[PDB]
Amino acid sequence: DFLQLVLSRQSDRAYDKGRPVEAEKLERILEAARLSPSACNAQPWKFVVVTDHELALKVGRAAAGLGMNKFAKDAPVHILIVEESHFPLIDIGIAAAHITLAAESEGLGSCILGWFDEKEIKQLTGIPASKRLLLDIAIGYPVKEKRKKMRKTKEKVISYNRY
Amino acid sequence: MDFLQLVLSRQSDRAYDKGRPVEAEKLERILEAARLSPSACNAQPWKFVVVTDHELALKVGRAAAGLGMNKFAKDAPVHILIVEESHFPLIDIGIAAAHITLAAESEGLGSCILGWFDEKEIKQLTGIPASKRLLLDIAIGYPVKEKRKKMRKTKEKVISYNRY
């Protein structure tokens, strides 16, 4: 069920460092991303997929800071989402949902990262200074269990026929 | 395998079967998917205003139409209005929209994300504070027209490995 996939997908903050992601799994994740809807079908994104062992280490280190994202250096894959000139931001959320749901459907863990050293990750991967790097999605096999979800109550987030 | 088949079958449906209602249990599964979306800091900066009343749906759908776009919205029996509840909020709302439309497709329902609409009229019809930003209406209902193949950029334009 789709709902079981939604429930099992979580932010994994620990990865098996020595354990590679298979090329066919990653390709299906990026296909899900590419096939995302977008306003005007503008598809205003580029996914820079870091799979090189040494590069991924460096990208994951540049995602860490201020006590956050220490686990990022352990994920063997980092999908960097660059805005390709409002709706772009909505569109990139769409694509992130498709990446992380696809990762979970493939037995892989993921974590969307909005906090990182944008400058350094852009230098490491040759992204122009003038392009906005918006998210890094870490991908790898998880080592910790499924935590229980915390969400706001229905009444705070959902009303019928009425604000 | 299955997930990718779902991603390919989900599409923007631009015609609805006007007399066929959406089962409440299907709607509830879609809203559960939306609620369970991830968000930066788990802030969940959204409220879903779910229009199921036949007359109100008609009016919200009509207020989505203009410049010859979105004329089919008035035929959708359900409208999920996504209101921002204080960057990340916009990314978060796109996450939630993906969850809603994938969930709709998994239930055998059609959907269309609408970013263009008469925001003031829809707010006035539904009670949404003037000062709160209504960002999307997702129309939900049973489709009339068939599945199309996707038009997307080539892999090479949107995907590069290890370097931009």
Ligand SMILES: Cc1cc2nc3c(=O)[nH]c(=O)nc-3n(C[C@H](O)[C@H](O)[C@H](O)COP(=O)(O)O)c2cc1C
């Ligand atoms: C943020 C957003 C806003 C959209 N607004 C509209 C709209 O107002 N009217 C419309 O007909 N389609 C709307 N679309 C649908 C897009 O045209 C559609 O997703 C895109 O063409 C890709 O086609 P597909 O959804 O059928 O794969 C919107 C999509 C997104 C993501």
Ligand SMILES: Cc1cc2nc3c(=O)[nH]c(=O)nc-3n(C[C@H](O)[C@H](O)[C@H](O)COP(=O)(O)O)c2cc1C
């Ligand atoms: C836009 C965005 C950015 C995120 N940034 C981070 C981040 O930098 N570090 C982190 O540990 N989690 C990050 N997360 C994950 C959220 O904390 C997480 O999705 C939320 O707490 C709900 O938990 P769940 O994803 O396990 O269901 C981010 C999520 C989103 C949507």
Ligand SMILES: [Cl-]
């Ligand atoms: Cl559009």
Ligand SMILES: [Cl-]
């Ligand atoms: Cl967070």
